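Record C2 domain-containing protein-like, 161 aa.
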Amino acid sequence: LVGLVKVRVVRGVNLAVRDLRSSDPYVIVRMGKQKLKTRVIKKTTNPEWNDELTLSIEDPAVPVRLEVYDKDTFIDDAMGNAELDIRPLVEVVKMKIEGVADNTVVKKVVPNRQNCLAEESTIYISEGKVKQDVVLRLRDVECGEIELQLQWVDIPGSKGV
Ligand SMILES: [K+]
Ligand SMILES: [K+]
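=>
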């Protein structure tokens, strides 16, 4: 492993309705074959999950994938998906910035037609730590955004594989 990334799934905003008036949403978060899930919150389209899911990083070029679903007795309807590139986070990690003020913004990632960003994403230092604030717009669904906060975790050493 090269490190860990704490993915705090903060909230879903205006998610799709999949059970007539509301939904029972959860997120599956993947990095390749690695997969984790948030809790389910019942009968909301604005879930305040605030669930932190920690991914082991082996290859930072593999996207982090997020899939939202409705929990249901018969079929768990999809409620959109998105993905995120953690290479910008890793780029800032490699700058080895230390000793600065909290919330020192050092890199910004802009939305474009290929990525899933809803707005400019900021990568910042709150020491020792490298963090990223992300809002993702969901694909393959009529509405919905997911708000995330990422945090890099270094794996202490020990060096030379
Ligand atoms: K349904
Ligand atoms: K449901």
